[PDB]
Paper text:
Rotaviruses are the leading etiologic agent of viral gastroenteritis in infants and young children worldwide and are responsible for an estimated 140,000 deaths each year in developing countries.
Two different crystalline forms of Pc VP8* in its apo form were obtained. The first form, VP8*-Apo1, diffracts at 1.35 Å resolution and presents a single copy of Pc VP8* in the crystal asymmetric unit (ASU) while the second form, VP8*-Apo2, diffracts to 1.5 Å and presents two copies in the ASU. The three copies of Pc VP8* in these two crystalline forms present the galectin fold with two twisted β-sheets separated by a superficial cleft that conforms the glycan binding site in P and P genotypes. Superimposition of the individual VP8* protomers from these crystals showed that the three molecules of Pc VP8* are almost identical (RMSD 0.28 Å for the superposition of all the Cα). Furthermore, Pc VP8* are also structurally identical (RMSDs 0.37–0.57 Å) to the VP8* apo forms of the linage I PWa and PRotarix, supporting that the glycan binding site is preformed in the Pc VP8* protein.
Author numbering: 3 to 162
The structure:
Amino acid sequence: MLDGPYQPTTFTPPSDYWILINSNTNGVVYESTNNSDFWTAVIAVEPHVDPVDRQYNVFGENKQFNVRNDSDKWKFLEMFRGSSQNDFYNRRTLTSNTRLVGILKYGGRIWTFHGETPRATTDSSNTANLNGISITIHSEFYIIPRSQESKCNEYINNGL
């Protein structure tokens, strides 16, 4: 039940579907917010990057983040804030040779994968406004129903 690929766009998915983004370059992979209590932007860092300050345009704001990647695999840094006044901190990191980043709205929370392939695992983030969270996606993506999360886990950890 893997549908796609779909080209980069902005939308608000329904609950109960994994969005699986096939990142093909460094920089911002997606940006997601409800404009109240939830902002997440994922930043892709290519292998073998010494600590360095990099600039990224997220939510129309130029931000500087100090990044690194000591591993041969790509790193996907979740940058989160809970308020517009709050600084974007690296809340989770997905280290992956599969370049598959996932997001699901389910059960009043946002679910994403983090850890290191092929052992990456899901994690939840709370919000008081799940429905209002939209997403801007900068690479091609797929959709798969939550009922097939075992398959989604397989794709995140072992590839398409």
